[PDB]
Amino acid sequence: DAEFRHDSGYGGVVIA
Amino acid sequence: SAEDKAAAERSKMIDKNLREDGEKAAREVKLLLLGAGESGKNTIVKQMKIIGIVETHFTFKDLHFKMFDVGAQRSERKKWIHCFEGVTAIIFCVALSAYDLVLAEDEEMNRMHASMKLFDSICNNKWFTDTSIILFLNKKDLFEEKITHSPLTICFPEYTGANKYDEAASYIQSKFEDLNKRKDTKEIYTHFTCSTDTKNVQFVFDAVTDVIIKNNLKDCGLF
Amino acid sequence: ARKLVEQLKMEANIDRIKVSKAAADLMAYCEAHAKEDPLLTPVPASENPFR
Amino acid sequence: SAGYTVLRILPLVVLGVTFVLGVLGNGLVIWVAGFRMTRTVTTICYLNLALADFSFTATLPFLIVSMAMGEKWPFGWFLCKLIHIVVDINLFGSVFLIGFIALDRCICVLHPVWAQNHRTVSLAMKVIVGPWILALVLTLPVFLFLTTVTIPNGDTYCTFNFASWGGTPEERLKVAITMLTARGIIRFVIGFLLPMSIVAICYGLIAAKIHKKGMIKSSRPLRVLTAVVASFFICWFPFQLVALLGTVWLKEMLFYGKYKIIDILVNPTSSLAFFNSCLNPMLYVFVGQDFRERLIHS
Amino acid sequence: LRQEAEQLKNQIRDARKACADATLSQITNNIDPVGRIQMRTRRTLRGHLAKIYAMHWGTDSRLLVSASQDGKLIIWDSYTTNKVHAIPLRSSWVMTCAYAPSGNYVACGGLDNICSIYNLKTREGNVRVSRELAGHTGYLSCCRFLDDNQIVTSSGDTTCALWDIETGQQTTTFTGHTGDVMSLSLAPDTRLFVSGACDASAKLWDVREGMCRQTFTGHESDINAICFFPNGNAFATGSDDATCRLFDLRADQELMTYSHDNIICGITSVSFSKSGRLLLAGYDDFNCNVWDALKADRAGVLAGHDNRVSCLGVTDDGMAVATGSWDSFLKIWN
DSSP states (O other), X not given: XXXXXXXXXXXXXXXX | OHHHHHHHHHHHHHHHHHHHHHHHHXXXXXXXXXXXXXXXXXXXXXXXXXXXXXXXXXXXXXXXXXXXXXXXXXXXXXXXXXXXXXXXXXXXXXXXXXXXXXXXSOSSXXXXXXXXXXXXXXXXXXXXXXXXXXXXXXXXXHHHHHHHHSOGGGTOSSOOSOOOHHHHHHHHHXXXXXXXXXXXXXXXXXXXXXXXXXXXXXXHHHHHHHHHHHHHHHHHTOX | OHHHHHHHHHXXXXXXXXXXXXXHHXXXXXXXXXXXXXXXXXXXXXXXXXX | OHHHHHHHHHHHHHHHHHHHHHHHHHHHHHIIIIIHSOOOHHHHHHHHHHHHHHHHHHTHHHHHHHHHXXXXXXXXXXXXXXXXXXXXXXXXXXXXXXXXXXXXXXXXXXXXXXXXXXXXXXXXHHHHHHHHHHHHHHHHHHHHTBOOEEOTTSOEEOOBOOHHHHSSHHHHHXXXXXXXXXXXXXXXXXXXXXHHHHHHHHXXXXXXXXXXXXXXXXXXXXXXXXXXXXHHHHHHHHHHHHHHHHHHTHHIIIIIXXXXXXXXXXXXXXXXXXXXXXXXXXXXXTTOHHHHHHHHHO | OHHHHHHHHHHHHHHHHHHOSSOHHHHGGGSOOOOOOOOOEEEEEOOOXXXXXXXXEOXXXXXXXXXXXXXXXXXXXXXXXXXXXXXXXXOSOEEEEEEOSSSSEEEEEETTSEEEEEESOOSSSSXXXXXXXXXXXXXXXXXXXXXXXXXXXXXXXXXXXXXXXXXXXXXXXXXXXXXXXXXXXXXXXXXXXXXXXXXXXXXXXXXTTOSEEEEEOOOSSOEEEEEEOTTSSEXXXXXXXXXXXXXXXXXXXXXXXXXXXXXXXXXXXXXXXXXXXXXEEEXXXXXXXXXXXXXXXXXXXXXXXXXXEEEEEEOTTOSOEEEEETTSOEEEEO
């Protein structure tokens, strides 16, 4: 469906 | 060049009509009929006629059917039997009462034995490997009255006995499915012709519906 | 069988030439028209309408 | 630890074999169905699914080299944008084609008359353009919101950034929370709940009707159906569950990082989902006898 | 009576041995083999949705008509791969189709026992059937146009008939075949034609005289194809015994045979090139085998058909050969 991308506007924690 | 492009639109418009008419051809199922010698093939057509070879079109339960009769073709079957490839099913008509009869063309060859020989050819041929047969047994009412007067042992010497309507029909049937070598690939839908309307066409509709499911599963990949 | 025999008489009363003379005529036509056969010799692309 | 390093290397090799088998299988399926086969509704759906899988797999080595060194993107902003949009579009495309193939099979089995009368090539195109439109609608957040940012330490990661949209750090963080929650719930519902409910119901009714009508000559159809449903479940459900857990724990992860297991668990689940996208034509197209005959004839 | 007919047949067979001084292959060994020819599919005609049974090339070498089981008679512009006309048919079961030498008429027939002629030069702009030939009790296997007014049709009732377009019924009826007639071929002078039937025998007929001038018995299986030599002196017969036989009119004897051990499938269509040196014969191996007429050596292969090839035609000038198969595809080879 959608690749998991996690971040904020500027820190976030994600995994490609 | 205007001339080359002028005919380009003609081909595109013709292509649109070809696929639209081709979809209508695939919109309807095709059924082939075999058998002759007053086997009841003509009777099946009249009761299923809701609306050269005989071609008629009728619609039952929002399903469009095609009826083909090849009794007029007196030539060899194998020359034109490959033309009827892709038919949904084959409606084979067998006269139950024809067991105690003799063919006019040959006295040694039985009328019903020729039906099985004709039935065997349409199943063992390579052009109908996956085409199911909707076997139809006709004249069951006339067969019932004559089974008491005349026995089945004349047609089949290797008959156990008990010449009743129920036992003979099972033995008469069992010869036909055993004639089909490709049991797994194709299925024989056997029914007895009934005088009541909406009954015989229902069996054809039910058998065609089962074949359509089987054909769809084969294309999908389940089968 | 009257029709069968009458047709056979007409077929019998024909001139059948030797195979060697007949074979030479078939071979002569092939040689005389070999240059005019686009299938026997590769036709040039410019002359060929099919690209 | 030793297990953690293996748990990190495993997605790399899984994605490499996914790339290889996807390229080969999708290429063969496209070559046979698109050019060497007559157009058919089932053939059309298979071709669209294979095209989506191939387009996803073509850009998959970019994901491999990104996950090789921890989400870092050696390439530019536009190329990362294109790769991510392609991956997202093709993933929703594969999921929606799976769901629509299930729906089409259910329609053909339950209502053979309607399928014979109405399922045509033109109608197939008219109803197959829809899933792609839905994929674009669900991907448009990648179209606008996704950007590329560079960490001051030197590393660069192209992920979501809301400096321009928010305009202030507080508004940007609020917009991040809102959009991430919306995207997570949308993915879980439309991307997972909608097809899984469709796939289970469609294939459930097919098995129910086949068993009721006694068409089970061999265990092959039931085995194929069970394999399809089980593979789709055991592959997509882990990744979707991990994404949903990360979405519902959005504040905890962003502000305090209470749940760190999702951070190391997304990669194996993503690799499993991509392996499912790879294997979809293997049991959706190769199972057909006619396709095998055409392939061996080619 | 019966003994005389049997004795006459032996007398004809004895005359064959007298004329058989030397085979063609021994005589033609001196000429250089043509060799291997690389033929590619120049154009692919993809407009049919059912198997194709017959096709005919035009005199202008650009328009060809193809008959398929979908019920549509399509005239193809081979130069630009375009469809000039699409003709719906009353019966979708058609075995043969013909194209008039002038190009204004196209005829097809099949299991409907009716040979329908359609005019392509209608003033209104829509193609409609002009005449419907009725009187055949067997399936129409082959039909060829002698001219805009005379057409000969081969039927499945072991009988071949010559029809008149304006008159509406058969003018001359040709009888003598034991098996069902399957193929027809018209000589360039149009005066004579040959027919191949199911009795493993192909015989020559006269348009004017209306009886069998010569009968050839060299096949051992069902003959399905026939075609005259470009000069009209000889013709080739394709049967189901995987062999093609060349018969000479002026010799009344099988000149030579086209046989290969590897192929065991029958021939569905056959014709000749412009010079007649190159023989092209369809087969059931999903491909066309191209033979050398003189030496019976393979010169090329026209593989590329997903299904069995049933029709094959070489245009009058021999520019290209078109093969139609059961995969609803027509390939232009050159």
